[PDB]
Amino acid sequence: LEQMGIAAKQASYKLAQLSSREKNRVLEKIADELEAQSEIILNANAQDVADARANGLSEAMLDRLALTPARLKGIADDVRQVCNLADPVGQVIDGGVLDSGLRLERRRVPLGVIGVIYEARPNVTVDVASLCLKTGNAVILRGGKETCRTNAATVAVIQDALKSCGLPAGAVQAIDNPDRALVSEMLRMDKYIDMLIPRGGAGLHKLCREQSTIPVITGGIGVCHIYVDESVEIAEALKVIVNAKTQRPSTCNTVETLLVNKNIADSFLPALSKQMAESGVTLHADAAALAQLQAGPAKVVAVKAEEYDDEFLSLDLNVKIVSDLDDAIAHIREHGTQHSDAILTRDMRNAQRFVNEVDSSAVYVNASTRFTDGGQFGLGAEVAVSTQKLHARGPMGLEALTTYKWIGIGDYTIRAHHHHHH
Amino acid sequence: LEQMGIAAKQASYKLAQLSSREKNRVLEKIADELEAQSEIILNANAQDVADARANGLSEAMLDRLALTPARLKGIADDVRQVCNLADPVGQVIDGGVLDSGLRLERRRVPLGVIGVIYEARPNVTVDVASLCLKTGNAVILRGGKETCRTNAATVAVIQDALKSCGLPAGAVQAIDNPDRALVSEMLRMDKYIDMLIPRGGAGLHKLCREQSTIPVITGGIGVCHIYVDESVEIAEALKVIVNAKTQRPSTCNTVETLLVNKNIADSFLPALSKQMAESGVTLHADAAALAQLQAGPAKVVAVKAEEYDDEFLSLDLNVKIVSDLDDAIAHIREHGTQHSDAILTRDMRNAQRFVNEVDSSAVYVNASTRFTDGGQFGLGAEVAVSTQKLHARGPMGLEALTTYKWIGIGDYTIRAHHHHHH
Amino acid sequence: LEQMGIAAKQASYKLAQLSSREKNRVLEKIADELEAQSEIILNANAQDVADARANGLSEAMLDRLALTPARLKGIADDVRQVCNLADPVGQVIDGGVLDSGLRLERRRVPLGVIGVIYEARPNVTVDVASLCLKTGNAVILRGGKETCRTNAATVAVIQDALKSCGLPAGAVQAIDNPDRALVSEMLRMDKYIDMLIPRGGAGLHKLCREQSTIPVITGGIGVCHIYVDESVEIAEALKVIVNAKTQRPSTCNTVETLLVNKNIADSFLPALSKQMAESGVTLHADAAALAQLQAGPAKVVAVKAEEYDDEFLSLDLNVKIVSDLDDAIAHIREHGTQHSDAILTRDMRNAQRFVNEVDSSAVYVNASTRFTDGGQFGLGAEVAVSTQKLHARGPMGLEALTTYKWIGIGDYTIRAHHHHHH
Amino acid sequence: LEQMGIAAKQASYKLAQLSSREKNRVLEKIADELEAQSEIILNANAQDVADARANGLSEAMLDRLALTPARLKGIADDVRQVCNLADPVGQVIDGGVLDSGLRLERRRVPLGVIGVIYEARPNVTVDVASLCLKTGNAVILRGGKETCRTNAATVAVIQDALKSCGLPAGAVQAIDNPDRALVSEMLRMDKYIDMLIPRGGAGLHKLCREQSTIPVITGGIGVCHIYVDESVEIAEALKVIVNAKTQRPSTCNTVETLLVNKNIADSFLPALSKQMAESGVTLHADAAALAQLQAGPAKVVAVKAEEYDDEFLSLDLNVKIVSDLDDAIAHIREHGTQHSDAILTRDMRNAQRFVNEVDSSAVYVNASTRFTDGGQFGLGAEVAVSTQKLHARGPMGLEALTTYKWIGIGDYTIRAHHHHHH
Numbered sequence A, B, C, D: 001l002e003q004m005g006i007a008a009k010q011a012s013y014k015l016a017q018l019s020s021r022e023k024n025r026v027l028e029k030i031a032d033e034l035e036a037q038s039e040i041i042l043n044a045n046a047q048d049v050a051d052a053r054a055n056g057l058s059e060a061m062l063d064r065l066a067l068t069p070a071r072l073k074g075i076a077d078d079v080r081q082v083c084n085l086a087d088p089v090g091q092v093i094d095g096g097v098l099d100s101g102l103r104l105e106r107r108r109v110p111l112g113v114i115g116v117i118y119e120a121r122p123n124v125t126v127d128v129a130s131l132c133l134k135t136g137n138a139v140i141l142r143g144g145k146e147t148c149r150t151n152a153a154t155v156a157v158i159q160d161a162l163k164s165c166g167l168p169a170g171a172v173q174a175i176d177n178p179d180r181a182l183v184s185e186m187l188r189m190d191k192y193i194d195m196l197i198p199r200g201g202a203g204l205h206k207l208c209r210e211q212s213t214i215p216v217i218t219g220g221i222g223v224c225h226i227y228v229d230e231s232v233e234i235a236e237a238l239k240v241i242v243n244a245k246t247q248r249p250s251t252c253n254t255v256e257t258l259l260v261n262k263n264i265a266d267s268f269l270p271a272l273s274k275q276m277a278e279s280g281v282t283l284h285a286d287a288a289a290l291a292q293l294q295a296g297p298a299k300v301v302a303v304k305a306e307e308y309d310d311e312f313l314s315l316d317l318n319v320k321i322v323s324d325l326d327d328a329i330a331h332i333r334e335h336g337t338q339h340s341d342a343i344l345t346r347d348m349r350n351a352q353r354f355v356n357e358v359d360s361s362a363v364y365v366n367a368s369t370r371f372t373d374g375g376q377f378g379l380g381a382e383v384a385v386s387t388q389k390l391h392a393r394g395p396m397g398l399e400a401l402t403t404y405k406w407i408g409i410g411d412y413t414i415r416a417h418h419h420h421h422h
């Protein structure tokens, strides 16, 4: 896999100097070719989905894997949107004049070579390739075996467009072998890859962090908690909860726990059960709320200790009764994965305290937790949602793949031994 | 060492909720006590220098270890300057209104618990503690054995000033034992330390990166190249080179390799030798420049292949003759540590090309390479000079120790299933 | 007065090129000399206050005119705080690379010659001179006839410091004649003064705007309205109102009208009357609130139609009963002078609506209207509060006195006849 | 005209609260309808151009008045580019937490009502209307006699789209009376119009600045000077000058004076004459430079003392021999209108000095003065080029029509009488 690193590193230097016009031309050709060859991508995706059904995969899993003509048009529109954004490379962050006469400034520069290991999803390949081309980084892709056909078809189109536009062929490359030894080999190619983006569950992150010598920005799993305060409107809160849970349960920003204040549990729980029975979602309630939720039409079962720390990725929910805001904050800190947390309330003080005392990557007040997306946050698209602290956090835009560089200009200036200041 | 992380984590939560008033009060008390206890630090540092000098330590190492009273006043002034900087915690990076009606914004928040492993220098302890206190991070310190007395004396005052203000004791703590097993133990405390800052040579960085489970911002070694173009003024270039080399040769942002254009070598080299003979710097010259430098009064010897990738940390310099700008750029890319690089020229095109094609953390045009400092760059102080590309780069200041958080406010807003855009 | 403008214009060109070190030296010397010569300023101010009191000046007016050693130390501290701020001249606002290869950026530059006509206050002279020196603008001062001795002494001190530091003597100059013919003469010197800052009442603003040929940033009069919602805590709202009204009633950011919701008035008014009787403030209640406030210990009188549109500048307040939030917003739009408006409430929706729908220079939620100050808002000091919409708004700091300038660099770039875009 | 202001003021309040979705819908519908009704606009423009030639209009003026189908497609593309820009309304400029505990921030808000008095050009109406709709301001338009038909046709389409989208009909309105009494009447409507943007020559600006009570952002006239240094490449400088002069000489950002260094004059003038004769531009040379230019094929005539202070708006140029850089800077300051100035040189020191010492809306180094455009500078479109210093400067984009507003939120915070600081 050494030649992979050689090809990526050599292509990165050429890419870093390309003007925005060439990158925009490549992106526009990519979108046009994507829309042109819909019949082959759709056929390959449908065949792969049918093959996946033969292995008894979950319905939500197939829905994530499935690609419709509407989804193809949506990803083409996202490519055009990222083409329409301003190029972050070359932008000036800040500047000034020092007391010694030196003109200082910071300019954004491309990262270099980016290696991404991502889950079985077709659109993520296109999104990553488009973002890396627009920013000016050489990317190396490696996805799950489930999306082998769609990825093999889309990378061919991307490479053909790259050849057509005259850009070096090593800019965007992928690995087709589903072997996991190649992943371990890639994890050790530190001299080529500058930063690695793994998207997956706990096992992939454990294996990567165990045998990594490259900077890693973990996508991380998501356990999103929603806290219902004592003073809140039942009708509005139920709609927000339904939107956060039912719509696309297979994602990561879906709510997994529902912390309910003990003062409002008298009337909120019976209405929640009635709504959830229509929604058809099993409630893994706590012992305290078991008595209240037993009479509800929605089916309810006792919760286990380990159930709080993992995602259901289906129509399931955890119901816990807390004493006050401090208890909910402590529980969120203890069991949360720092992905997304929202509070539904009518009190200003409680909202401010929750915003201040919660360290999740995104905090919402009277809003759904499904807003944690690259497109929803105003950015063109996202490669992953960062749950770590270094470099980017939350959704990743064009800025997340760029670093700055100090530039100084002077008239043969020399640093003085004694730096006086006022 | 588990209690170390427990105390640091417990103190970080309380620290992140403080206001600028208490932090500024503690910083001002720190500066006042530093100026009010000059004799203790002075005598401890003098005793440590006397003990270390008896072990054959290099003169520049003693100069780095020495603490002139003027230097103590300088570090007190730097602390007071930090006290005068605007608090970066709570600042809003950007914001806006989304299409769905959500009000979005990003706010700076403290990183958490910061572990540092620095070289034997007395002022770094004070600078790191002051910056971490101002930002709001709990810091764990571990320095070299050469600075045991001075570091103990300083940390005593720093810990004592915490009690006088009511802040928790676990805010600033250090490890006194120079045992290297404790360093390996700290490297594995991932659940408490959020980010590690190692400052040192190649061996320490290799050891850390080999057994690191914590995000690491490497200080990195410094090999700084200075390029001399065909069209340049000899008198000013000589002064710039002398300022870059002679002044404090024991630092890291000191030029180590001199790249001289072949067209200007015949006139530049004889003057360079005459100027450098006064400074006493031994010129490790290439074979091509050996003939020109032999006649010069300055001491000149042949250079070895491995000598190009190490810091002399003394009054030494490497002289190499290159063909044109492309050769110098290739050599800088091949043998550079991406720390600092400067070009001396009178051609606009060459200057722009050098700024564009060089990926060092700092690039200067007609200026010294000694400007890569926290104080010089406009920041209050620096913890280290980052050479990597993730998170911060170049000098690291108040902003480099803070991360951001998305906050969204709505009125029971729910994400639409299909999102149109224009 | 032509020589006045000639000297100011000549001094501005030299000032714009000065470095931050020289400006900081001048500011530090000014502060040191101001502290050294405290007795002369104190004696002159005391004599002027005694002379003014012989003319039956108001107690609040005298307090505004009066200066104490604590106030002198405060203005010295504000001068030093200005000296400690970063120089805004030469800073880069934003930059980038265009599609045609042109490197574009914006750099802050000084405005030029600034003329200011201000009320009889002693500290405004010092603040204006310090800000103009720090930014790099030549200033012309013309104060009220009341503050003659103090302004003359301060101007003499500042001119002596300017002479000592070697800066041109035309940088800071003032007109001592209280004749208003010269004021009309100054309004027509368009070829020298670049921007005018009048501070005063309606008469001065009308006179200036009637005969102005120079850009004007009107200070404007201040009619600040406070709205009390139906759901609010009485104890906290009463303290906020007391702080907003009683403390320094002679300013401009003091509440003059109290809009009370009709649903809460029955309980709010009796407590407000009890508090205001202790505060000793006459209530100019409306007809609707007259019945409720008649039984209150606080003195209450009927209000007049014209009383809503002017400042009392004393211990007086207007009480009006409104139906709902829309009525209060309409009244604020009709009678407000767009200076400062605050709402006290416990409802999130009402707070957001009030923030969105009120076009004032500053809007507060559950806070006093006395925060509209340069020092409070995080800036060093303020020259005036701008109630207009052009250029700066609200408090005017260092960045309010600076303009930007586009700078482009290219390699003999030429604009293409047809500009394609993507 | 009172109903005009009444309708504009009523529409402004409703427009300020509109979300970006509705504004984008209106802009997209406007662009689509402009594309659909190309034939009517083309016919009206052709008829107006033919009628203008009956009055002997200048060829450059005719070209400016002429609207080819390609120009119509271009303005539709500019509208669609505006529709793709981020909405500046609601954006946060900066923020933070104060010492007293108040969360401050600044949010952009629409200016209000904007009155535009522009020249005879058909594409300006579309751009002004699109920008005012995108920002959220109500606009009042007043063109010239030569564009009485095309502007009416465009306004009909814009009003039809406004009616279709359901927005208030008073948002965009115009006056179709060439009577100049109405202009003077509009200049005095201070209670409705918040800011006026006049575009024209000296007479219109004198008339507006003589009788007006509204803030004015003057477009001004353009006298762009180009300085040729001693050391410069002849061919590249000649190409840059040809691009700046020949291409569209009817604009404002076109060079009208050539400042040539005396040292390079002998080797530069004959080549300039040879190129200039091919260009066909007449050279209004100075007496000193007349001897060299009297032999070249290009037509040369003596220059008068008043031609230096006005635009030729045709194929004419001024040639003057300066002593050095200081003389050129003095001449530029004396006779320049602060619109655009460029320097062609190969010396870094001279370039930096020229950038620092020259005050203009835009300064270029080795570039063309034809880049001073809204589209070229990265903005979607421009309403005018501001040569003044208040509010915006240079090209005026989307953010130029917006102002900010301080917002503060606290928990019943009250200002303290004594404000401590560190």
Ligand SMILES: NC(=O)c1ccc[n+]([C@@H]2O[C@H](COP(=O)([O-])OP(=O)(O)OC[C@H]3O[C@@H](n4cnc5c(N)ncnc54)[C@H](OP(=O)(O)O)[C@@H]3O)[C@@H](O)[C@H]2O)c1
Residues within 6 Å of the ligand: A117, A118, A119, A120, A143, A144, A145, A146, A178, A180, A183, A199, A200, A201, A202, A203, A204, A207, A218, A219, A220, A221, A222, A251, A252, A311, A384, A385, A386
């Ligand atoms: N934080 C984010 O931004 C984000 C985004 C998307 C998804 N997610 C998370 O993704 C999870 C579900 O993903 P999924 O359905 O694709 O299942 P998964 O098991 O999390 O997927 C793991 C991914 O890595 C590969 N992989 C798995 N085990 C591996 C190993 N031992 N060595 C190397 N590679 C390995 C998988 O392909 P192979 O099995 O063929 O090797 C797949 O590409 C959820 O927990 C969700 O929260 C997070």
Ligand SMILES: NC(=O)c1ccc[n+]([C@@H]2O[C@H](COP(=O)([O-])OP(=O)(O)OC[C@H]3O[C@@H](n4cnc5c(N)ncnc54)[C@H](OP(=O)(O)O)[C@@H]3O)[C@@H](O)[C@H]2O)c1
Residues within 6 Å of the ligand: B117, B118, B119, B120, B143, B144, B145, B146, B178, B180, B183, B199, B200, B201, B202, B203, B204, B207, B218, B219, B220, B221, B222, B251, B252, B311, B384, B385, B386
């Ligand atoms: N990039 C930057 O910002 C920056 C800043 C300052 C200095 N530097 C670099 O510092 C270098 C010189 O530093 P120095 O004179 O102090 O020598 P050094 O050998 O680089 O210092 C290593 C530091 O780590 C410790 N250390 C050494 N070996 C270790 C090991 N195996 N395991 C754990 N800890 C270990 C040392 O104390 P013990 O030996 O007692 O363990 C000392 O504190 C230069 O190369 C310079 O460029 C870089």
Ligand SMILES: NC(=O)c1ccc[n+]([C@@H]2O[C@H](COP(=O)([O-])OP(=O)(O)OC[C@H]3O[C@@H](n4cnc5c(N)ncnc54)[C@H](OP(=O)(O)O)[C@@H]3O)[C@@H](O)[C@H]2O)c1
Residues within 6 Å of the ligand: C117, C118, C119, C120, C143, C144, C145, C146, C178, C180, C183, C199, C200, C201, C202, C203, C204, C207, C218, C219, C220, C221, C222, C251, C252, C311, C384, C385, C386
């Ligand atoms: N918006 C702000 O930032 C701000 C700041 C401070 C004060 N203010 C306002 O200041 C007002 C009170 O100021 P004040 O007590 O000094 O009374 P004032 O009558 O408003 O003061 C007018 C100022 O201009 C001068 N002046 C008055 N009439 C003039 C005329 N016809 N032609 C030329 N100059 C004239 C005055 O000195 P002479 O009378 O000797 O000419 C004085 O300097 C309040 O309404 C307050 O809101 C506003």
Ligand SMILES: NC(=O)c1ccc[n+]([C@@H]2O[C@H](COP(=O)([O-])OP(=O)(O)OC[C@H]3O[C@@H](n4cnc5c(N)ncnc54)[C@H](OP(=O)(O)O)[C@@H]3O)[C@@H](O)[C@H]2O)c1
Residues within 6 Å of the ligand: D117, D118, D119, D120, D143, D144, D145, D146, D178, D180, D183, D199, D200, D201, D202, D203, D204, D207, D218, D219, D220, D221, D222, D251, D252, D311, D384, D385, D386
């Ligand atoms: N700085 C900029 O951004 C900018 C942009 C475009 C153009 N310009 C300048 O525009 C000038 C040429 O413009 P132009 O060819 O249209 O000629 P002009 O005479 O400058 O045009 C004056 C404009 O105002 C009107 N006007 C003229 N005299 C007036 C008066 N006494 N009262 C009221 N309105 C009056 C004209 O229409 P009526 O004559 O029918 O009244 C026309 O709309 C050049 O100097 C150029 O530099 C500057």
